[PDB]
Design a protein around this ligand. Structure first.
Ligand code: K
Ligand code: MG
Ligand code: MG
Length: 186
RNA sequence: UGUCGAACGGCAAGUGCCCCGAAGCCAUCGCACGGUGGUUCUCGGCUGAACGCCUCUAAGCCAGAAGCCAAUCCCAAGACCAGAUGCCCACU
Protein backbone atom coordinates (compact mmCIF):
# COMPACT_ATOMS: atom_id res chain seq x y z
CA UNK A 1 0.00 0.00 0.00
CA UNK A 2 0.99 3.65 -0.48
CA UNK A 3 1.18 5.68 2.73
CA UNK A 4 0.15 8.94 1.06
CA UNK A 5 -1.36 9.78 -2.32
CA UNK A 6 -2.39 13.32 -3.21
CA UNK A 7 -4.22 15.28 -5.88
CA UNK A 8 -4.05 19.08 -5.84
CA UNK A 9 -6.29 21.54 -7.70
CA UNK A 10 -5.99 25.32 -8.05
CA UNK A 11 -9.11 27.33 -7.22
CA UNK A 12 -9.72 30.50 -9.29
CA UNK A 13 -10.28 33.86 -7.62
CA UNK A 14 -14.04 34.11 -8.12
CA UNK A 15 -14.98 30.65 -6.85
CA UNK A 16 -14.86 29.40 -3.25
CA UNK A 17 -14.78 25.67 -2.44
CA UNK A 18 -16.04 24.42 0.93
CA UNK A 19 -15.75 20.82 2.16
CA UNK A 20 -17.45 19.37 5.24
CA UNK A 21 -17.82 15.62 5.76
CA UNK A 22 -16.91 14.75 2.15
CA UNK A 23 -19.67 17.09 0.91
CA UNK A 24 -18.24 19.62 -1.54
CA UNK A 25 -19.93 22.94 -2.31
CA UNK A 26 -18.50 25.35 -4.88
CA UNK A 27 -19.98 28.85 -4.77
CA UNK A 28 -19.11 31.64 -7.18
CA UNK A 29 -20.78 33.89 -9.70
CA UNK A 30 -23.51 32.44 -11.91
CA UNK A 31 -24.63 29.99 -9.22
CA UNK A 32 -23.72 27.38 -6.63
CA UNK A 33 -23.03 23.65 -7.05
CA UNK A 34 -22.99 20.84 -4.49
CA UNK A 35 -21.74 17.25 -4.67
CA UNK A 36 -22.14 14.42 -2.15
CA UNK A 37 -19.00 12.25 -2.08
CA UNK A 38 -19.64 10.45 1.21
CA UNK A 39 -19.21 7.11 -0.61
CA UNK A 40 -15.53 7.80 -1.35
CA UNK A 41 -13.78 8.02 2.05
CA UNK A 42 -10.94 10.40 1.18
CA UNK A 43 -9.26 13.28 3.02
CA UNK A 44 -10.44 16.55 1.46
CA UNK A 45 -8.73 19.78 2.51
CA UNK A 46 -9.12 23.34 1.26
CA UNK A 47 -6.42 25.98 1.75
CA UNK A 48 -8.24 29.29 1.32
CA UNK A 49 -5.12 31.46 1.57
CA UNK A 50 -3.32 29.52 -1.17
CA UNK A 51 -6.57 28.68 -3.02
CA UNK A 52 -5.84 24.95 -3.20
CA UNK A 53 -8.09 21.89 -2.97
CA UNK A 54 -6.26 18.73 -1.91
CA UNK A 55 -7.62 15.17 -1.86
CA UNK A 56 -5.55 12.55 -0.02
CA UNK A 57 -5.68 8.77 0.31
CA UNK A 58 -3.80 7.15 3.21
CA UNK A 59 -2.64 3.52 2.95
CA UNK A 60 -4.50 2.90 -0.29
CA UNK A 61 -4.36 0.26 -3.01
CA UNK A 62 -4.93 0.87 -6.72
CA UNK A 63 -8.73 0.76 -6.40
CA UNK A 64 -8.90 3.42 -3.63
CA UNK A 65 -6.20 5.49 -5.34
CA UNK A 66 -8.20 5.58 -8.59
CA UNK A 67 -10.78 7.82 -6.88
CA UNK A 68 -8.38 10.73 -6.25
CA UNK A 69 -8.35 11.88 -9.87
CA UNK A 70 -12.09 11.25 -10.19
CA UNK A 71 -12.74 13.54 -7.21
CA UNK A 72 -10.35 16.15 -8.61
CA UNK A 73 -12.10 16.04 -11.99
CA UNK A 74 -15.52 16.34 -10.34
CA UNK A 75 -14.43 19.41 -8.36
CA UNK A 76 -12.83 20.91 -11.48
CA UNK A 77 -16.07 20.33 -13.40
CA UNK A 78 -18.10 22.06 -10.69
CA UNK A 79 -15.65 24.98 -10.67
CA UNK A 80 -15.85 25.27 -14.46
CA UNK A 81 -19.65 25.11 -14.40
CA UNK A 82 -19.90 27.73 -11.66
CA UNK A 83 -17.51 30.03 -13.53
CA UNK A 84 -18.41 29.67 -17.23
CA UNK A 85 -21.25 27.12 -17.34
CA UNK A 86 -21.84 24.36 -19.88
CA UNK A 87 -23.56 24.44 -23.27
CA UNK A 88 -24.39 21.36 -25.33
CA UNK A 89 -25.56 21.83 -28.92
CA UNK A 90 -27.44 18.89 -30.45
CA UNK A 91 -28.51 18.70 -34.08
CA UNK A 92 -31.34 16.79 -35.73
CA UNK A 93 -29.98 14.86 -38.71
CA UNK A 94 -32.39 13.19 -41.12
CA UNK A 95 -32.41 11.80 -44.66
CA UNK A 96 -36.04 11.95 -45.82
CA UNK A 97 -38.47 12.77 -42.99
CA UNK A 98 -37.85 16.11 -41.23
CA UNK A 99 -37.60 15.73 -37.46
CA UNK A 100 -39.88 18.40 -35.97
CA UNK A 101 -38.75 19.44 -32.48
CA UNK A 102 -40.93 21.81 -30.46
CA UNK A 103 -39.54 23.29 -27.24
CA UNK A 104 -41.95 24.63 -24.63
CA UNK A 105 -40.94 25.64 -21.12
CA UNK A 106 -38.77 22.73 -19.96
CA UNK A 107 -40.61 20.44 -22.41
CA UNK A 108 -39.34 18.90 -25.66
CA UNK A 109 -41.63 17.21 -28.18
CA UNK A 110 -40.19 15.29 -31.14
CA UNK A 111 -42.46 14.40 -34.06
CA UNK A 112 -42.06 12.76 -37.47
CA UNK A 113 -38.89 10.87 -36.58
CA UNK A 114 -38.63 8.46 -39.54
CA UNK A 115 -42.27 9.22 -40.34
CA UNK A 116 -43.56 7.79 -37.06
CA UNK A 117 -46.87 9.04 -35.68
CA UNK A 118 -45.66 8.63 -32.08
CA UNK A 119 -44.70 11.82 -30.24
CA UNK A 120 -41.61 11.68 -28.02
CA UNK A 121 -41.85 13.87 -24.92
CA UNK A 122 -38.97 14.83 -22.63
CA UNK A 123 -39.15 16.85 -19.40
CA UNK A 124 -36.03 18.88 -18.59
CA UNK A 125 -35.21 19.73 -14.94
CA UNK A 126 -35.39 23.37 -13.89
CA UNK A 127 -31.60 23.39 -13.40
CA UNK A 128 -31.06 22.91 -17.16
CA UNK A 129 -32.40 25.41 -19.70
CA UNK A 130 -33.38 24.10 -23.14
CA UNK A 131 -33.71 26.39 -26.16
CA UNK A 132 -34.07 26.00 -29.92
CA UNK A 133 -31.86 27.93 -32.32
CA UNK A 134 -33.82 29.66 -35.05
CA UNK A 135 -33.44 27.93 -38.45
CA UNK A 136 -32.02 31.07 -40.10
CA UNK A 137 -28.74 30.64 -38.21
CA UNK A 138 -28.47 26.84 -37.96
CA UNK A 139 -31.13 24.28 -38.85
CA UNK A 140 -32.71 22.01 -36.21
CA UNK A 141 -30.36 22.81 -33.33
CA UNK A 142 -31.30 22.44 -29.65
CA UNK A 143 -29.11 24.01 -26.96
CA UNK A 144 -28.90 22.80 -23.35
CA UNK A 145 -27.41 25.23 -20.84
CA UNK A 146 -26.52 24.73 -17.20
CA UNK A 147 -23.98 24.82 -14.40
CA UNK A 148 -23.84 21.05 -13.80
CA UNK A 149 -22.02 19.15 -16.54
CA UNK A 150 -23.62 15.88 -15.43
CA UNK A 151 -27.02 17.58 -15.70
CA UNK A 152 -26.44 19.43 -19.03
CA UNK A 153 -25.30 16.06 -20.46
CA UNK A 154 -27.75 13.15 -19.78
CA UNK A 155 -30.44 15.60 -21.04
CA UNK A 156 -28.61 15.72 -24.42
CA UNK A 157 -28.38 11.89 -24.15
CA UNK A 158 -32.03 11.19 -23.15
CA UNK A 159 -32.80 13.21 -26.31
CA UNK A 160 -30.37 11.17 -28.41
CA UNK A 161 -31.52 7.87 -26.89
CA UNK A 162 -35.24 8.47 -27.43
CA UNK A 163 -34.76 8.91 -31.20
CA UNK A 164 -33.16 5.55 -31.97
CA UNK A 165 -33.77 3.63 -35.20
CA UNK A 166 -35.32 0.22 -34.49
CA UNK A 167 -35.61 -2.96 -36.56
CA UNK A 168 -33.58 -1.32 -39.35
CA UNK A 169 -30.01 -1.10 -40.56
CA UNK A 170 -28.07 1.48 -38.57
CA UNK A 171 -25.31 1.77 -41.18
CA UNK A 172 -28.15 2.99 -43.36
CA UNK A 173 -30.84 5.12 -41.69
CA UNK A 174 -28.33 7.37 -39.94
CA UNK A 175 -30.97 9.86 -38.77
CA UNK A 176 -31.23 10.92 -35.15
CA UNK A 177 -30.38 13.68 -32.70
CA UNK A 178 -26.63 13.94 -32.17
CA UNK A 179 -24.51 16.09 -29.87
CA UNK A 180 -22.25 18.13 -32.15
CA UNK A 181 -20.46 20.71 -29.98
CA UNK A 182 -19.90 20.78 -26.22
CA UNK A 183 -18.80 24.17 -24.91
CA UNK A 184 -19.49 26.82 -22.25
CA UNK A 185 -21.88 29.76 -22.04
CA UNK A 186 -19.54 32.45 -20.65
C1' U B 1 -105.69 -49.75 -26.23
C1' G B 2 -108.22 -51.40 -21.80
C1' U B 3 -111.76 -50.02 -17.87
C1' C B 4 -115.85 -47.57 -14.28
C1' G B 5 -123.20 -49.17 -18.30
C1' A B 6 -123.00 -44.32 -21.87
C1' A B 7 -122.03 -38.99 -21.46
C1' C B 8 -119.30 -36.14 -17.79
C1' G B 9 -115.23 -37.02 -14.69
C1' G B 10 -111.61 -39.60 -15.20
C1' C B 11 -108.43 -43.82 -14.58
C1' A B 12 -104.38 -48.17 -15.95
C1' A B 13 -100.35 -48.62 -19.76
C1' G B 14 -93.88 -47.87 -13.49
C1' U B 15 -94.67 -39.98 -16.70
C1' G B 16 -99.16 -44.62 -22.67
C1' C B 17 -98.01 -41.39 -26.61
C1' C B 18 -98.12 -36.49 -29.54
C1' C B 19 -98.19 -30.84 -29.71
C1' C B 20 -97.54 -26.33 -27.33
C1' G B 21 -95.75 -24.85 -22.48
C1' A B 22 -94.54 -21.04 -17.55
C1' A B 23 -91.04 -20.58 -13.67
C1' G B 24 -86.37 -22.27 -12.58
C1' C B 25 -81.80 -24.01 -14.32
C1' C B 26 -78.65 -23.48 -18.32
C1' A B 27 -75.20 -22.36 -23.78
C1' U B 28 -68.74 -18.67 -26.46
C1' C B 29 -75.78 -21.89 -28.68
C1' G B 30 -77.12 -16.10 -25.51
C1' C B 31 -75.19 -11.58 -22.74
C1' A B 32 -71.78 -8.41 -19.38
C1' C B 33 -67.02 -7.31 -17.41
C1' G B 34 -61.53 -8.33 -17.29
C1' G B 35 -56.99 -1.66 -14.07
C1' U B 36 -51.76 0.42 -11.77
C1' G B 37 -46.85 1.52 -10.15
C1' G B 38 -41.96 0.13 -8.95
C1' U B 39 -37.29 -2.78 -8.78
C1' U B 40 -34.23 -4.51 -12.11
C1' C B 41 -32.03 -8.31 -16.52
C1' U B 42 -30.03 -7.93 -21.39
C1' C B 43 -28.54 -3.74 -23.65
C1' G B 44 -27.36 1.16 -24.83
C1' G B 45 -25.63 5.55 -22.67
C1' C B 46 -23.65 9.88 -18.95
C1' U B 47 -19.82 11.76 -15.96
C1' G B 48 -15.03 9.65 -15.05
C1' A B 49 -10.23 7.70 -13.21
C1' A B 50 -6.92 3.94 -13.07
C1' C B 51 -3.29 4.45 -17.41
C1' G B 52 -0.38 12.88 -18.68
C1' C B 53 -4.51 9.76 -23.72
C1' C B 54 -8.43 6.63 -23.74
C1' U B 55 -12.46 4.18 -21.79
C1' C B 56 -20.74 2.65 -19.99
C1' U B 57 -17.27 1.43 -14.38
C1' A B 58 -14.15 1.43 -11.08
C1' A B 59 -16.60 5.27 -7.26
C1' G B 60 -20.72 7.32 -9.07
C1' C B 61 -25.04 8.05 -12.59
C1' C B 62 -29.36 7.75 -16.65
C1' A B 63 -32.59 4.92 -19.21
C1' G B 64 -34.50 0.21 -19.34
C1' A B 65 -37.89 -7.21 -20.51
C1' A B 66 -44.31 -10.50 -21.51
C1' G B 67 -39.09 -11.61 -16.05
C1' C B 68 -39.59 -10.00 -10.64
C1' C B 69 -42.08 -7.07 -6.48
C1' A B 70 -46.07 -4.22 -4.66
C1' A B 71 -51.19 -1.88 -5.88
C1' U B 72 -56.12 -3.70 -7.71
C1' C B 73 -58.37 -8.66 -6.97
C1' C B 74 -59.69 -13.69 -3.63
C1' C B 75 -59.08 -15.82 1.69
C1' A B 76 -58.00 -13.62 5.86
C1' A B 77 -56.00 -12.28 13.86
C1' G B 78 -52.99 -19.40 15.77
C1' A B 79 -51.15 -12.43 12.83
C1' C B 80 -54.24 -14.34 19.34
C1' C B 81 -55.77 -6.53 16.68
C1' A B 82 -54.08 -2.30 24.13
C1' G B 83 -58.73 -1.33 16.32
C1' A B 84 -63.33 1.38 17.19
C1' U B 85 -68.08 0.83 18.92
C1' G B 86 -73.94 -0.86 21.05
C1' C B 87 -76.09 -2.88 25.33
C1' C B 88 -75.95 -5.45 30.07
C1' C B 89 -72.79 -7.31 34.09
C1' A B 90 -68.47 -7.26 37.20
C1' C B 91 -65.23 -3.76 39.38
C1' U B 92 -65.75 0.70 41.18
K1 K C 1 -90.91 -28.35 -26.46
MG1 MG D 1 -103.23 -41.80 -16.55
MG1 MG E 1 -106.56 -51.44 -11.91
Amino acid sequence: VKVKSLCTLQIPEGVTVDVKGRKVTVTGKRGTLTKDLTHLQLDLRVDKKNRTFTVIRWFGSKIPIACLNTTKAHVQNMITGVTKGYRFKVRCAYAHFPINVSVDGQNIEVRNFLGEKRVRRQLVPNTVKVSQTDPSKVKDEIVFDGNDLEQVSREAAVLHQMCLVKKKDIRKFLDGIYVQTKTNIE
